Amino acid sequence: FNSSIGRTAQGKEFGVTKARWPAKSVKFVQGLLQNAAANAEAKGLDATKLYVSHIQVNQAP
Amino acid sequence: SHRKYEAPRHGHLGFLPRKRAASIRARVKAFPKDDRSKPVALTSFLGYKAGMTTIVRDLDRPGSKFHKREVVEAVTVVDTPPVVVVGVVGYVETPRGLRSLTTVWAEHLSDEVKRRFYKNWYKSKKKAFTKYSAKYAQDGAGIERELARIKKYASVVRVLVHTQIRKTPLAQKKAHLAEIQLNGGSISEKVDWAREHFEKTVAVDSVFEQNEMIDAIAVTKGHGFEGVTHRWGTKKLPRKTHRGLRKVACIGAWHPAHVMWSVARAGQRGYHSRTSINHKIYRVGKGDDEANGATSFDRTKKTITPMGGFVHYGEIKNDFIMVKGCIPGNRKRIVTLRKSLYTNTSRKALEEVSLKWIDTASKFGKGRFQTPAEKHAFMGTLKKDL
Amino acid sequence: MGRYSVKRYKTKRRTRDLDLIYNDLSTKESVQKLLNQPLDETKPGLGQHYCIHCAKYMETAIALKTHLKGKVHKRRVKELRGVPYTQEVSDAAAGYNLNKFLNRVQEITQSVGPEKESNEALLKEHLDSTL
Amino acid sequence: MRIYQCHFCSSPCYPGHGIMFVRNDAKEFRFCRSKCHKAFKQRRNPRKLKWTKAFRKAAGKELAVDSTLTFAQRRNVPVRYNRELVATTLKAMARIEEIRQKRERAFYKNRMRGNKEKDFLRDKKLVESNPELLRIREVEIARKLAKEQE
Amino acid sequence: SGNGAQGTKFRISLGLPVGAIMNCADNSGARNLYIIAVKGSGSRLNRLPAASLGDMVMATVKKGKPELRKKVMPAIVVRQAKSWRRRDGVFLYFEDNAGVIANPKGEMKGSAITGPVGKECADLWPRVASNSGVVV
Amino acid sequence: AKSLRASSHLNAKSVKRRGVFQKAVDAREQRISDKLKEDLLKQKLEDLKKKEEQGISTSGWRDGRHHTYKKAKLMKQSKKKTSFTRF
RNA sequence: UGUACAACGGGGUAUUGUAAGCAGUAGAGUAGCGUUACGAUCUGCUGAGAUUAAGCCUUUGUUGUCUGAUUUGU
RNA sequence: GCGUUGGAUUGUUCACCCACUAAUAGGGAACGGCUGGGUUUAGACCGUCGUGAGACAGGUUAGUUUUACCCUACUGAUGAAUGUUACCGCAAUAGUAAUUGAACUUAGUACGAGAGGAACAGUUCAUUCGGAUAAUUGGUUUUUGCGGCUGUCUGAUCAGGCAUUGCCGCGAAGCUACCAUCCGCUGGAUUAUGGCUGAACGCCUCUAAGUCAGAAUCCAUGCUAGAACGCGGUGAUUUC
RNA sequence: GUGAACAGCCUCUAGUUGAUAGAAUAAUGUAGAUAAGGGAAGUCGGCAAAAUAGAUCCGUAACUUCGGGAUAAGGAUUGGC
Numbered sequence A: 001f002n003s004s005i006g007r008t009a010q011g012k013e014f015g016v017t018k019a020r021w022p023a024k025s026v027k028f029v030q031g032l033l034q035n036a037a038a039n040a041e042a043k044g045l046d047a048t049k050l051y052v053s054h055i056q057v058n059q060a061p
Numbered sequence B: 001s002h003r004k005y006e007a008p009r010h011g012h013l014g015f016l017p018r019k020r021a022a023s024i025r026a027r028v029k030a031f032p033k034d035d036r037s038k039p040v041a042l043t044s045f046l047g048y049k050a051g052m053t054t055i056v057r058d059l060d061r062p063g064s065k066f067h068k069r070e071v072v073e074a075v076t077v078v079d080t081p082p083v084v085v086v087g088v089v090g091y092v093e094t095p096r097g098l099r100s101l102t103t104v105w106a107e108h109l110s111d112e113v114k115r116r117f118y119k120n121w122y123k124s125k126k127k128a129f130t131k132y133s134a135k136y137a138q139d140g141a142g143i144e145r146e147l148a149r150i151k152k153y154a155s156v157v158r159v160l161v162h163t164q165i166r167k168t169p170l171a172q173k174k175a176h177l178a179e180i181q182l183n184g185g186s187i188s189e190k191v192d193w194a195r196e197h198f199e200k201t202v203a204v205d206s207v208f209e210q211n212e213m214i215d216a217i218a219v220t221k222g223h224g225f226e227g228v229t230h231r232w233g234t235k236k237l238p239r240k241t242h243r244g245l246r247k248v249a250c251i252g253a254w255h256p257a258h259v260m261w262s263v264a265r266a267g268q269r270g271y272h273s274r275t276s277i278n279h280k281i282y283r284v285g286k287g288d289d290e291a292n293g294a295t296s297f298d299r300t301k302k303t304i305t306p307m308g309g310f311v312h313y314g315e316i317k318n319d320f321i322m323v324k325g326c327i328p329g330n331r332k333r334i335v336t337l338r339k340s341l342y343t344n345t346s347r348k349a350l351e352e353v354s355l356k357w358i359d360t361a362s363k364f365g366k367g368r369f370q371t372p373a374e375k376h377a378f379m380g381t382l383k384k385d386l
Numbered sequence C: 001m002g003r004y005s006v007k008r009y010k011t012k013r014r015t016r017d018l019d020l021i022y023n024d025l026s027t028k029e030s031v032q033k034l035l036n037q038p039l040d041e042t043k044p045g046l047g048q049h050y051c052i053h054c055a056k057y058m059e060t061a062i063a064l065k066t067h068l069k070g071k072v073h074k075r076r077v078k079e080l081r082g083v084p085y086t087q088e089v090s091d092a093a094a095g096y097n098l099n100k101f102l103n104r105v106q107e108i109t110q111s112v113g114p115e116k117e118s119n120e121a122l123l124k125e126h127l128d129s130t131l
Numbered sequence D: 001m002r003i004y005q006c007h008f009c010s011s012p013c014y015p016g017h018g019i020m021f022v023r024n025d026a027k028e029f030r031f032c033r034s035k036c037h038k039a040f041k042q043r044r045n046p047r048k049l050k051w052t053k054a055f056r057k058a059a060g061k062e063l064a065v066d067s068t069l070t071f072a073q074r075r076n077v078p079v080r081y082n083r084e085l086v087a088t089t090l091k092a093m094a095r096i097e098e099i100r101q102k103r104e105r106a107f108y109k110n111r112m113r114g115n116k117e118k119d120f121l122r123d124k125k126l127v128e129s130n131p132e133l134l135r136i137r138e139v140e141i142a143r144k145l146a147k148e149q150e
Numbered sequence E: 001s002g003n004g005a006q007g008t009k010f011r012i013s014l015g016l017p018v019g020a021i022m023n024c025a026d027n028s029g030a031r032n033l034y035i036i037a038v039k040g041s042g043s044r045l046n047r048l049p050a051a052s053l054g055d056m057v058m059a060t061v062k063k064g065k066p067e068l069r070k071k072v073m074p075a076i077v078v079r080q081a082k083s084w085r086r087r088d089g090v091f092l093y094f095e096d097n098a099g100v101i102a103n104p105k106g107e108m109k110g111s112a113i114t115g116p117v118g119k120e121c122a123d124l125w126p127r128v129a130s131n132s133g134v135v136v
Numbered sequence F: 001a002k003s004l005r006a007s008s009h010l011n012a013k014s015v016k017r018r019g020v021f022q023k024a025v026d027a028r029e030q031r032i033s034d035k036l037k038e039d040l041l042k043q044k045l046e047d048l049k050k051k052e053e054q055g056i057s058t059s060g061w062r063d064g065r066h067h068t069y070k071k072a073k074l075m076k077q078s079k080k081k082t083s084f085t086r087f
Numbered sequence G: 001u002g003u004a005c006a007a008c009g010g011g012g013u014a015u016u017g018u019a020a021g022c023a024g025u026a027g028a029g030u031a032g033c034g035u036u037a038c039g040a041u042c043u044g045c046u047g048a049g050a051u052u053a054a055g056c057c058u059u060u061g062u063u064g065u066c067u068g069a070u071u072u073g074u
Numbered sequence H: 001g002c003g004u005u006g007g008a009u010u011g012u013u014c015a016c017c018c019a020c021u022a023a024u025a026g027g028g029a030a031c032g033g034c035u036g037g038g039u040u041u042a043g044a045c046c047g048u049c050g051u052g053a054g055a056c057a058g059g060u061u062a063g064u065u066u067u068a069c070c071c072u073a074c075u076g077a078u079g080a081a082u083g084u085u086a087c088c089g090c091a092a093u094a095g096u097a098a099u100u101g102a103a104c105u106u107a108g109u110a111c112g113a114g115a116g117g118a119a120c121a122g123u124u125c126a127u128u129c130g131g132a133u134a135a136u137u138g139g140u141u142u143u144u145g146c147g148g149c150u151g152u153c154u155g156a157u158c159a160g161g162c163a164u165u166g167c168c169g170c171g172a173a174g175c176u177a178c179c180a181u182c183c184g185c186u187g188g189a190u191u192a193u194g195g196c197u198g199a200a201c202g203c204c205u206c207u208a209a210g211u212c213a214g215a216a217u218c219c220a221u222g223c224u225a226g227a228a229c230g231c232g233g234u235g236a237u238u239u240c
Numbered sequence I: 001g002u003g004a005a006c007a008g009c010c011u012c013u014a015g016u017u018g019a020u021a022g023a024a025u026a027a028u029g030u031a032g033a034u035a036a037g038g039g040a041a042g043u044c045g046g047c048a049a050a051a052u053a054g055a056u057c058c059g060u061a062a063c064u065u066c067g068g069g070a071u072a073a074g075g076a077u078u079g080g081c
Ligand SMILES: [Mg+2]
Pocket: A004
């Protein structure tokens, strides 16, 4: 979803030209990440070996 | 149907595309034809454009209305410190054109030219050519073999030189490196000259002299995105024309159902490679001359530098080339000065220039005085002097 | 640069210079010629009613009288008092032809000055009597 | 080739500088700057504008009559070229300029004598008229000296 | 560069386009000259032919003698108010634009010229220099 | 008028070019060569004065690095079938 | 960790046009008793004062700064 | 190949005059975007016709249509990947540009009863176009840099606010002007044509075989870009 | 307060400081200005802009229903003390 987006030099890390800084989306995803970390800690999993093995976003009503 | 009134088209179709140049240093696309009878000589030189000033010239031009009279002319000053020879490249001829066969470098390179190979100099370990320099040990085998290869196979010999940018007032510390073709004796003689001149400097008066015609090769001043009116010289549309008057009214009215490549469009102006020819050298000034801005008519002991220095550039402390008129590029830009590609047959190429006066007033305003001593002599004693 | 000064001091709208007016007022013959002008159909007032100090034609003698009873005319008359400031003054200020400037100044002080003053006085009384 | 003097402000006019206006009586007016040219077009008085040499000479800010100021004048009767005369002239010009600068410095010093006396009298009157601020100054200096001591 | 002109002419800033009115500096009876064409002018779309100092124009007399009016005559520009550069090193201009009536060979109709005459025009035209009392 | 590419004008230009213009070019070239030799000699003298205080077959490969790189490049071209001259 | 970089400061180079404060015997006159009071303005200290890179030049001064993040192998 | 103009005129111009100029050639890509004539609907008046509603042989005047952010084309600008990264280059292909007049000398010579009157070679400027450039001149000013003016407000001085950049003068820097300055070339192959040798055809013939020159023509030299899937030379190549 | 003035501009009492923000300053726009020399050569057409402007004094034609035209036109001036 990138038609008519400005270009930036910070996209060269991922080999693109179009990149942005969506603060609201980042905050929501950060909250979910913190919650997942808390759930793993309650389960007793090693926090240094955790990786995001599944993430899925679809459209709400 | 046909256009009612004829007019020449706007713009030159041979300078297309009007895009930004690939490098800030303009490429030399052609060198003078090599004559094997002549002694070895360089075909070009590198300088930095400092600014412009004014001269008075005593003209000797038979048949002219200004014969035996004075003329006021504009000149451009190019700061030209000696370049340093650091390499040699051999070129062979193939059915696909000229191909570089091998390159030989000098044993020791300075940090000025080492910085050209780095994007982040302050963080690097500065390892460039550190293993290449080890090939000069124990009689320099390998170096000798590559020089012999150039002698045996090359048809063109170029010498790699770099500018001494530390001598200029420029804030940039990275030097400029370029190939200059050697025109002179045999291929072996060119190779011997380059090898004996490794790590040595060449001054501008050992390439050019006074009253010579040269060519200026440089990238023009950039201007960014520009409309058609100033990009191509089109006429403005009448006042309050709908959708703008700084346009072309009709970009197409005929069958091809396309926009032609020959129609003026808005886009980049400036920052193009340009080669202008036949600029006469008015002075080859030495940097150690205390009065390189003085003439036989003007006895004022002064240098070429105007009061307050050249605007946005600074003082001239090295050898300089004063050519008449203007050259492409702006102040502090690197420029390449090339020998003429042909024997010019105009009398202006044979004229001898005698300068009567060189302007050294301040370029930072309406400069009225040539020297600070003259300014103090005119004004007198100020309040802070007593 | 600004529009008022541009459209007042355009070259095509230039006025006569103060040194020229001083030369006109210095000699009695010039004053007589400027007072007795030939009838010109292109001039205001048929070339009559001419103020020499301001170098200006009036449509009527009453207009000339009102002009004489005014501060603009007084301003010009005050301007026309001293040395006319030719190029020799600026040359002397720079230090050039100082003796020539001094000779001109003493000539103005001795001979040209009082004659011009007497001519101005005679012109003033003539205008007061006739107007 | 010749250095001209500005009609308005007497500044030197070098070749290719300023602008010239020719009047109907063949009088040339050379101006070193657009500033002087526009002042002339507005018909301002250079003897009333303070930044001009004409005003300075008229008001006595710098000396105007001297022996060193009579060596330069327009030469309407040329002389035959003589190499030794040219060399003598070239040395004499430097000597004359040095002497003129010395005399200008002396003139300015004579003009500005008395300033020290006036400034001293003003300072003395101010010190006499401000007793309370001096007491504040003494208190501040004493506190600073006590701080330095301890 | 015109018939009767002596030698080549170097470029001068153009001051008088077609439609301009200049003063008449000779004594033939004309008061002003109205420019209708410029001799030797170039061809370019939308560009007005313009005269400079020393150029020959075709002019009609607007103010002057009735016998002198209602005809087209050659004229030479001797003064212009647009500043132009002399190669000796100064830009200069006159108070007014002024010209003199001449024939196609460059010979003056009058016998004298009043007011200053530009050096360029006087050196270009020998008859102007012969009839000029003030040359710059 | 005669164009820049007019044959007779170019012939007259060549006749002129063979004379004084070429002679002046040759004299300038000789002077510049002499100045270049003088500059080299002066640099040699300065280097000697500075040091006063202090005191062939072209066959085969160029080097082992070149041999390894070129052999690997040709092997890669043969394996990937992207050679210009060899099937 | 240096012909290091920066923020200030200094010196040039320019633009404008003579700062604030004090004083005078200069000031058309008028009022009270030659003096004083008011007084546009004039004169002196004063080419003074102000600005000067933000895309000007230069720098023996003062005060600081030098550091994090990501990726890349035949 | 390269140019082919500036204007007057609508009681009509399906054109005609004046001038400049080297010259003011003809035409196609429509006639198989702004803008005036014109398909201009509702208002109105005059004329002709009609018994009338009305229509016209007609004449005059006034009268809202308003994309683009889509695809493509065009102009410029980035960019993944083939070990990485950096520097110096080559040139397939594409584009291409210069133009006209005058002047000195040749010369008052050739030619010519006279009146008149050239050119090549050697030199100097300018028209149109193109590419740059800002030393100088001019223009521009939110440098709100300096100064001044009106009205009001901060008690006065000083120092300042507001007046939709208040107004006036100068004004560096930058930008910019045929309103400023500079620069814009030389090798092969040809056309028309003029020839050589020479048959056809025991004469002859520039043509048939062969061959010499020759146009602002062509292809190059030179100039611009550089294949993002064309290429070469060279430097360095990681200690957790 | 200025001013003829409930005009325009500035201020006291009282009342607001609301209208998505931040960063840069390409082209083209919308709104507003300045420009050498010439002065309608532009254009179907002076469209649009520019120029004029308050007040005091002098002066003011044809025509006319005698009431007007008329601020006709054209000129001189304006601060402070
Ligand atoms: Mg958008």
